[model samples]
Target: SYDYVIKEYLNAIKKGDITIQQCNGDSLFHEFKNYVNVETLNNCKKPLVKVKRGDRVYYTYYGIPIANELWPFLNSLVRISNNVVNLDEREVELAKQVRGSVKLFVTPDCTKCPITAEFLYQVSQINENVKLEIYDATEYEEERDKYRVLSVPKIIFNDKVEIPG
Candidate 1:
């Protein structure tokens, strides 16, 4: 359920390009520029390249992955900081009161996979409280063996439930 919600949220975020905008606007870029200047851009470029989307990106209150029609109303309730692309302190405090959770697992790339990525995507839509950490089954052998996952879409929920499908 959490994974489903997260997937939907992620899809909404992707559809809205919220994370990309945050990446472009946040102090993350300026902070990175400063670090690059100090470390020498050439030396920092490779490591910087690795910092993509989910790694360094975050979306706050108004940026939450909800439908577009509700954003104007939602944005009105909170103030956005110009420096950091995250929820204002007030919103963060509110969010902290809620349950915090995350999801991690692996999925295979198959033509006729029963548990398609779309299924996961739908699950993500329903559960906004979970974060999905998807590992490619073909490449991550260590992860597969470590988790004892023998099939595609092996889902590990809250590190408590492991489903091999």
Candidate 2:
């Protein structure tokens, strides 16, 4: 399943060193911890991936980055190496003006979900005030129900502005 990611992972790391830091614990993390630059931290409530280069954190993945989510995960590494954001300057400036929490509800196999998640990640990276949290709808049924997530890519902004795609 990770064959595509493995190949891309090699190519991404070739540009620079990457540290895939894991919080809490996850089966996926355990499965791939032997990879070149994987580390686990003890203090966290949920399983998450924090892609880093030296002291700089590039991006974060809250749930398992498999299936369609793999591309965004690997893309974060490539972005770190290239040291660039895919968004335009105006877009970055726009994101910088936003504030508050952005929760994204998604499923692993949803094609569009990854795109939306990646876009939000980029936005959050641009502005520290935009706290982003992604949840796997399948894994968090109660949270999904609370948010009334009827479709994939359900985005809740600051406890308001619910948009489902």
Candidate 3:
């Protein structure tokens, strides 16, 4: 059911002059410029997508396949266009001096999670020094345990600033 949602996304992208590899497995790797989102969907698994824009890139996994959860990413689709999240170059040059990394742990069922995901993706566009990664909690049990994450969008910054799940 969720791939049906992803199909619509890829199809639209095809119309927009983009190419994506369609496959099934432990993770699906898709590197897209601009923005994309979803909390976490481990009901299913794929390789992982490496989202890139300019020199900034974020590696993240996709699909909770079994839960029939599409709203999270669907909501992300709508909001990325509406939300203003990217940093300005002048602002980036200053922050670039401050290096950081963020790991965003998410779950597909959470309504607010996608909004958060979209916001982070946009921020990655302007700031190259800051790296972001998204992990699906349902799929990565070790990560869930490593951080003792019981919730979604558990954000970790510089491997120190942890916004626990």
Candidate 4:
């Protein structure tokens, strides 16, 4: 049956300035696969993935998009503070001084990957000179190889340092 379950999901249309996932339909997710974009992994799953539809890079989440289900992988990326922590400010500023691009290649399922992504995202916010780009490792195998990743979460900073997140 193509019956839509309304109560089980967050707003699927637009919410405030952002577009919300509309339903829990696996069919719809695949149907709109091309439109989805990833700010990070774990944020999307079996129900819906975020889609800007025409711009930015996109990937698919292969599991159920529920808090109880997705938060284990998703929690690491959560910015607990309403504001960035002042404790991390010094390190962020220093990184800004030595400007370089940082790339995080991650997947939705990795246990350690989310924090690595959040770490980089926080740093990039403090430093305009430093850029951070996230690539879905599964979708971009060439990057996975370029970084020599054989693990769940790979953190690559610049074209140099590499580690498992």
Candidate 5:
């Protein structure tokens, strides 16, 4: 059903020097197989979409980045191509200097989740020191409950500080 729409989006990525890779056994990889040139990863804990440019990995999506979540993934690639980020100078510096881990809990239908995730993704792109792991709230019930995720886009920094988005 989303073939036409998704193809339209895929065409927009022609300008990006992007690489899309997927881990073996990812149940959702087929959702993007027809639209992108995806590579294979043999040793991963689960199925995931890993987006990169050159040798620097940018974002890792835990579940299928489809429906309303597609824009964030596509837009990130385009931004990376153009070397763009909406953050200010100070903010960019802060992101680059930070060294920590982030666990973002999100759902497919959550409208604001992409914005938060995209920002953090860009931050991770600027600095490899800040590692990010996105988790689908619906898919990881035990992890969600452990963090008491009552809302979407809940970010857990270093597995301690919680920021509700």
Candidate 6:
């Protein structure tokens, strides 16, 4: 019966995994009539799917567009320390202490590269030990030339590690 099939489908949805397709008229039913034969249509229940901000839905489902803004709060959710330094002695000290640390070099105008800055800022806000150093690529030509930075946003981790663009 349709009711039994729908009950199973609804149960799948409640378990947080299911795909549903909506159709108008009986074209779909007619097309699949031979495959989906049932004894009764009584007590049949239609499934309703709701989309939310953090919900991970299929790209083709519902014809709804996906946006990067929908994942604003989906961060690493881990606290990081920003003990960035420019001087040789401090850099050496940072190298010794900074294991599994993240560092970033960014320009002021690069809006697309705000994630690294935002992470550092948020970390600093939470802990006083977190440090972030913002350096202009133009001002630090030596460092830039050494790092071969051809982009506005460059991330450096663990004192000497450079993340690829």
Q: Could you estimate the TM-score for every candidate?
A: 0.35, 0.74, 0.56, 0.48, 0.77, 0.33
lDDT of 1 by residue, 1-120 (tens): 233433433333332312222222233333323222112223221112111223332222111122321222122112111112243466455544433333233333343332333333
Give per-residue CA lDDT, model 3, range 6-78, as digits (tens). Answer: 5665434432322222234423223222224322224434535443322323334443322323343333333
Residue 127 error, candidate 4, Å = 0.5
Residues 1-165, candidate 4: write the lDDT tens digits: 212332112223222122224334445344323322223334333233432223321222323333222332222122221223333657766766756656666666677766665555556445656555565666667767887877856656667854549
Clashing pairs in 5: none
Counting clashing residue pairs in each candidate, in order, gives: 11, 0, 15, 4, 0, 1
Q: What shift in Å separates residue 28 of candidate 4 from its native position after superposition? A: 9.0
Better of 1 and 5 by TM-score: 5
Please give, for residues 40-78, the per-residue lDDT of candidate 2 as tens digits.
878776567777768766456666667787777666666
The candidate 6 region of ten consecutive residues with least summed lDDT is 57-66
**Candidate 5 residues 1-165, lDDT tens each?**
665665666666666667788875344445445655568888776557788778877767776676677778777766776777888888899888877778888998898998998888789768888778788878767888888887898988778855558
* Regions more than 4 Å wrong, model 3: 1-46, 53-56, 62-98, 161-165
Residue pairs in candidate 2 whose N, alpha carbon or C atoms collide under 3 angstroms: none
- Candidate 3 matches the true fold with a TM-score of 0.56
Which segments of model 5 are wrong by more than 4 Å? 23-36, 42-46, 161-165
**Residue 116, candidate 5: C-alpha displacement in angstroms:** 0.7
RMSD of each: 13.4, 3.7, 7.3, 8.6, 3.7, 19.8
**Best prediction by TM-score:** 5
Query: What lDDT score belongs to each candidate, Candidate 1 first?
Result: 0.33, 0.72, 0.50, 0.45, 0.75, 0.35
Regions of candidate 4 where Cα sits further than 4 Å from its true position = 1-87, 161-165
In model 6, residue pairs whose N, Cα or C atoms come closer than 3 Å (at least 3 residues apart or on different chains), thus clashing, are 82-131
* Candidate 1 wrongly placed segments (more than 4 Å): 1-15, 18-109, 112-115, 161-165
lDDT of 3 at 147: 73
Which run of 10 residues does model 3 get worst, by summed lDDT?
14-23
